[PDB]
Design a protein around this ligand. Structure first.
Ligand SMILES: CN(C)c1ccc(O)c2c1C[C@H]1C[C@H]3[C@H](N(C)C)C(O)=C(C(N)=O)C(=O)[C@@]3(O)C(O)=C1C2=O
Ligand SMILES: CN(C)c1ccc(O)c2c1C[C@H]1C[C@H]3[C@H](N(C)C)C(O)=C(C(N)=O)C(=O)[C@@]3(O)C(O)=C1C2=O
Ligand SMILES: CN(C)c1ccc(O)c2c1C[C@H]1C[C@H]3[C@H](N(C)C)C(O)=C(C(N)=O)C(=O)[C@@]3(O)C(O)=C1C2=O
Ligand SMILES: [Ca+2]
Ligand SMILES: [Ca+2]
Ligand SMILES: [Ca+2]
Lengths: 119, 119, 119
């Protein structure tokens, strides 16, 4: 669920606030419309796409779905007892958190004008 | 719930992203403040009002409330086994999805400045 | 949960829409980044901090967590049957609602540019 995604990002990107990723580029916090502004934005687009696949599972609602995972010393693991939806959502979150850690954060892409950038 | 509202909009407006309706005018994604910018915005105001009525049911929390419905060939039906809250929320969503399909989407009303338009 | 926070604000600030507080300053609707714009924004920062403490309880997810409370004649009380998470979240919400009632609302701080104000 949303909180667990936040916590995964805290796990792999402890130096950044959740808020920095919650309104960034055309896709971080969003979906659809536009050319990704940079590589971090592309992480987010990939995450959105991953959630769309997870949503093909009936009643699978990624931001609402609780899953089981562990953050240990900056490493994320999704636990085996997750149901199909939980497992899928957990992996989407994990892969994104890892992607975010590697992508450089561009201050110029925070809280951008969607009309200007994302058509 | 929120996902189900998204899916209803996908049912009746399959050519548009959810994101296009998630920050539009003074009311799509919002409520209160302002004169609706256009007829689509008015759909959203009506939807907000509908949710306010549903919220008169104790512990009825529209964006969180799961309901039962079916999208078939672009037609939405709310199912009979819904509890009072579920039934009300489902109908609010259905009527809005239908409203959105008919209202023309004005690019100039996406992601507008609320201070400029919605006081 | 989020709806209950909204309702608490309705209890102590019945003359204002929820939407007025949902995107105000650097912290109302947000967290991290920036110097609070005014005393109301400081209420919100305090609320965010309070939620961070509540989140130290395992699986305590403030915006998702249902709690028991009563609004009577503009006075909020958190009820005794709340679990640890519910109790903590309820108090965070209560204290914020009270803070919001006392803090003057500055129209110039609604829906501000985060890049301009909150770095
Ligand atoms: C619309 N989408 C399917 C859902 C469904 C259920 C939800 O519970 C939510 C969303 C959207 C997401 C978007 C995310 C996005 N970001 C990842 C932080 C984001 O753009 C914000 C934001 N800062 O506006 C959210 O509202 C957000 O945090 C959020 O609270 C959401 C949320 O609460
Ligand atoms: C405040 N309101 C009562 C609630 C309660 C519970 C929720 O779970 C949520 C809301 C607000 C709604 C607003 C809607 C709005 N829209 C319909 C997409 C919207 O303005 C956004 C947005 N793009 O900022 C959301 O955060 C939003 O999608 C959302 O995620 C919400 C949401 O997650
Ligand atoms: C990210 N944060 C941990 C969560 C977790 C679960 C949630 O269900 C939600 C959030 C963020 C909050 C932010 C709040 C904020 N405000 C208090 C209204 C806010 O900035 C908005 C907004 N207008 O964009 C929300 O999306 C918001 O209403 C919301 O719907 C949230 C929400 O739905
Ligand atoms: Ca590159
Ligand atoms: Ca008209
Ligand atoms: Ca002061």
């Amino acid at each position: 669920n949303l909180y667990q995604f936040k916590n995964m990002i805290k796990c792999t990107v402890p130096s950044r606030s959740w808020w920095d990723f919650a309104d960034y580029g055309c896709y971080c916090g969003r979906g659809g419309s536009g050319t990704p502004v940079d590589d971090l934005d592309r992480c987010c687009q990939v995450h959105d796409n991953c959630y769309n696949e997870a949503e093909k599972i009936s009643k699978c609602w990624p931001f609402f779905k609780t899953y089981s995972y562990k953050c240990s010393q900056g490493t994320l693991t999704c636990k085996g007892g997750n149901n199909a939806c939980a497992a899928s959502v957990c992996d989407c979150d994990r892969l994104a958190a890892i992607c975010f850690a590697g992508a450089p954060y561009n201050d110029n892409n925070y809280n951008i004008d969607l009309k200007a950038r994302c058509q």
